[PDB]
Design a protein around this ligand. Sequence first.
Ligand SMILES: CC(=O)N[C@@H]1[C@@H](O)[C@H](O[C@@H]2O[C@H](CO)[C@@H](O[C@@H]3O[C@H](CO)[C@@H](O[C@@H]4O[C@H](CO)[C@@H](O[C@@H]5O[C@H](CO)[C@@H](O[C@@H]6O[C@H](CO)[C@@H](O[C@@H]7O[C@H](CO)[C@@H](O[C@@H]8O[C@H](CO)[C@@H](O)[C@H](O)[C@H]8NC(C)=O)[C@H](O)[C@H]7NC(C)=O)[C@H](O)[C@H]6NC(C)=O)[C@H](O)[C@H]5NC(C)=O)[C@H](O)[C@H]4NC(C)=O)[C@H](O)[C@H]3NC(C)=O)[C@H](O)[C@H]2NC(C)=O)[C@@H](CO)O[C@H]1O
Length: 540
Amino acid sequence: AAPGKPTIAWGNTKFAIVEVDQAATAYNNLVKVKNAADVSVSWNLWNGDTGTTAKVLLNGKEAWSGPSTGSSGTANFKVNKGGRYQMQVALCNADGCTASDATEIVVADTDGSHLAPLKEPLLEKNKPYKQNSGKVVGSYFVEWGVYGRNFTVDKIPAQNLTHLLYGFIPICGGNGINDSLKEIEGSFQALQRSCQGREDFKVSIHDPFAALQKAQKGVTAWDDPYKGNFGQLMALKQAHPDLKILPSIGGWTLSDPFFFMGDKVKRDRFVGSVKEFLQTWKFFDGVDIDWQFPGGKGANPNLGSPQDGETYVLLMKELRAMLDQLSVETGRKYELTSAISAGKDKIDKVAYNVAQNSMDHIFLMSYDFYGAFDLKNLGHQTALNAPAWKPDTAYTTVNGVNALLAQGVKPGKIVVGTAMYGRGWTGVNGYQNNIPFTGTATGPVKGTWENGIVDYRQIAGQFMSGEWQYTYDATAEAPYVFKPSTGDLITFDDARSVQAKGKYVLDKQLGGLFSWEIDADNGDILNSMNASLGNSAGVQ
Ligand SMILES: CC(=O)N[C@@H]1[C@@H](O)[C@H](O[C@@H]2O[C@H](CO)[C@@H](O[C@@H]3O[C@H](CO)[C@@H](O[C@@H]4O[C@H](CO)[C@@H](O[C@@H]5O[C@H](CO)[C@@H](O[C@@H]6O[C@H](CO)[C@@H](O[C@@H]7O[C@H](CO)[C@@H](O[C@@H]8O[C@H](CO)[C@@H](O)[C@H](O)[C@H]8NC(C)=O)[C@H](O)[C@H]7NC(C)=O)[C@H](O)[C@H]6NC(C)=O)[C@H](O)[C@H]5NC(C)=O)[C@H](O)[C@H]4NC(C)=O)[C@H](O)[C@H]3NC(C)=O)[C@H](O)[C@H]2NC(C)=O)[C@@H](CO)O[C@H]1O
């Protein structure tokens, strides 16, 4: 007679190809990429002949086989593809094979192949758009937004984006290499613990708790291997297979290491660490380089060199070569992008007409033109055009686009920036003709999270009522709210100025729109980005 039917033993059924060490704070120890997951299964036979061969099947296909030598057994074998499998133990002899009932086993990998899709409802004022314009619709999500800002990946209106950038992935390095980080409390030290035992100029994760271990919707079980932002992003990729999710390296406080990359030893170490990062975290679709800024004038007053433009061009070509190689290894398309200053004084330190041949998209940061970093010279922080009272204004969106176009950059590469925040001042005074921007200020406005900066959500929620004046400057294409009794002045984008940027993109055949930062919108900004670029309302 065939053997008795085995009963799978109770036991762990959740396994991982990329293992996460739950008692590690250094990035080198935190993750272990294997070529396959170590899986184990045990069984008992409660009734009958135990057969002479035992086999473990996954969806019918043998993963392990060995002699059946008694009423219980254990099998250890490797599974090299992530996903969920119906696993069975079968005992076989010459008269037949008798298979257990199926037990599902979960083999995790960092493409999210083990996860359910995270397809959450649109919140606040977000309305559904189809991505069918062919234009970029991008936004940044910030790793530290999950604490006080309380804005997690399940709150991103992800159907309404083509590109979701993750700010920020840091480059390892202590004194002299990430000194701008010392301005943020506990931040420099944070990085040094993440990078313990790890060479400088390799990438790491700045806050491993937020990125991988904090409990979040859909990744709450103790033994879900990837939680935090990265676990949710993997499940978001399962819901939106064509969303491009890019890791952004740098930003205002993490850009110092780029200034050392004229040393090709360091540059090559960095490039190889990026390749390793994308091999490890398979949900990411490329890399975004946010070096602020080639030539200096970023957070660190002691850095910046005439060499930086060449380094930026070489970095991009070598990034693209690495990604082209990773693309043919995997069959995947990988993207290389960069977010760049929109000021013409910074643009012309780089030959973007050469660097564009390595890049998919250039995220033109057409925001922060003005703000509480200068109390004397006030202006619209993200306007399309100069205002009527100063038609020679240097920092406008059009001037940064035109500086790029004058280099020879193809218009289709250029993605125009929209701000989901305002900048502002307090004590504005001494202005003519009811235009507060002709005055000077005494300090920054009271921010939502930091001085001088206000989420758009709060502008709409609190500063479009009461004593606040609202004006849409149709020359500049820029809204502003002003409280005459305190002299609080806030410059921001709103649905109409975004619509102007969107029509301008379509008119000039530019690449699309992106925004900083997704948590600060109530829906009005991203709704307008989508509509102004010609995406149809609704779902596919
Ligand atoms: C034409 C021309 O040339 N114009 C010129 C201008 O361009 C120029 O101005 C510059 O222009 C640039 C563009 O050209 C622009 O950069 C780009 O544009 C973006 C927009 O400006 C810019 O945005 C910047 O980005 C920086 C980073 O680079 C941001 O900095 C962040 O700031 C945050 C504070 O607001 C920081 O935060 C804190 O984060 C820490 C972690 O480090 C966190 O710590 C945790 O806290 C919680 C507590 O709640 C803890 O959690 C608890 O415990 C558990 C877990 O342990 C929890 O689970 C739990 O919930 C909780 N419980 C408890 C106890 O409550 C946890 O344990 C903590 N642990 C610690 C200590 O670690 C804090 O919570 C965070 N606090 C808050 C409030 O959030 C954040 O760290 C910091 N990030 C980094 C990486 O540094 C800025 O905010 C952001 N600004 C804006 C507008 O948003 C981008 O960088 C650039 N973009 C791109 C695409 O590259 C420049 O900004 C601009 N610079 C200036 C100066 O303005 C000017 C000047 O040169 O010149 C003109 O001429």
